[PDB]
Amino acid sequence: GEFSVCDSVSVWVGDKTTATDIKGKEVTVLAEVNINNSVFRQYFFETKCRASNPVESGCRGIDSKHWNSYCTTTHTFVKALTTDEKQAAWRFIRIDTACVCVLSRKAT
Amino acid sequence: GEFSVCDSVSVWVGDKTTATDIKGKEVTVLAEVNINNSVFRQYFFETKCRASNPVESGCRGIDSKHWNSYCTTTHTFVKALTTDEKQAAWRFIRIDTACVCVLSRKAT
């Protein structure tokens, strides 16, 4: 009977258009690549927060006495065909992969 | 000056050989492709848990009184070039991606 401090939602994203690369640059994702009688699509498995506060208090199961808390996304980096102002290239881009809890010393 | 409820450590993995694909099968990852001496390497950004218990009562910031808790590694899925000894193909494979706090209502 386990459970999570923060709630995830997962989605297959087949139409991403913008993203931030591992150098922190904003880049455009080429979701579709019409290479002749064939079409290549880029899909990403993204997991994000259902909400930044599961409970009004912040994250579920937290000691709201001494701890402020919120639920936030973390990321991995995945290679993706992209373009910037200059060139098309495979670049590592960040994508949401999990929802996690952020703490913070309470004002006490 | 914020705190994580689940401590993680991240590495880059560039010599992956074995994995589990999204169909649950065990596959071989082809780390490098050599084309005319030009070498394409696959790298994976993996995030795992430091320990199941950062704090001794499991996760940090948890109402130890009402809740039992123990951080744990979760995964995501990532395209990689692989073979199942029957075929070489890009398959979505499982990747350690975050360290999250698991909730368990203890007996009051």
Curated annotation (Swiss-Prot), chains A, B:
Disulfide bonds join C6-C71, C49-C99, C59-C101. It is found in: Secreted; Endosome lumen. One of its GO terms (biological process) is positive regulation of neuron projection development. Induction: Expression oscillates in a circadian manner in the suprachiasmatic nucleus (SCN) of the brain. Keywords: Cleavage on pair of basic residues, Disulfide bond, Endosome, Glycoprotein, Growth factor, Lipid-binding, Metalloenzyme inhibitor, Metalloprotease inhibitor, Protease inhibitor, Secreted, Signal. A 1-acyl-sn-glycero-3-phospho-(1D-myo-inositol) binds at R41, Y43, K79. A 1-acyl-sn-glycero-3-phospho-L-serine binds at R41, K79. One of its GO terms (cellular component) is endoplasmic reticulum lumen. Its main location: secreted. GO terms for molecular function: growth factor activity; lipid binding; metalloendopeptidase inhibitor activity; nerve growth factor receptor binding; transmembrane receptor protein tyrosine kinase activator activity. Detected in submaxillary gland (at protein level). Highly expressed in male submaxillary gland. Levels are much lower in female submaxillary gland. Nerve growth factor is important for the development and maintenance of the sympathetic and sensory nervous systems. Extracellular ligand for the NTRK1 and NGFR receptors, activates cellular signaling cascades to regulate neuronal proliferation, differentiation and survival. The immature NGF precursor (proNGF) functions as a ligand for the heterodimeric receptor formed by SORCS2 and NGFR, and activates cellular signaling cascades that lead to inactivation of RAC1 and/or RAC2, reorganization of the actin cytoskeleton and neuronal growth cone collapse. Belongs to the NGF-beta family. Homodimer. The homodimer interacts with a single NTRK1 chain. The homodimer interacts with a single NGFR chain. The NGF dimer interacts with a single SORCS2 chain (via extracellular domain). The NGF precursor (proNGF) binds to a receptor complex formed by SORT1 and NGFR, which leads to NGF endocytosis. Both mature NGF and the immature NGF precursor (proNGF) interact with SORCS2 and with the heterodimer formed by SORCS2 and NGFR (via extracellular domains). The NGF precursor (proNGF) has much higher affinity for SORCS2 than mature NGF. This is Beta-nerve growth factor. It comes from Mus musculus.
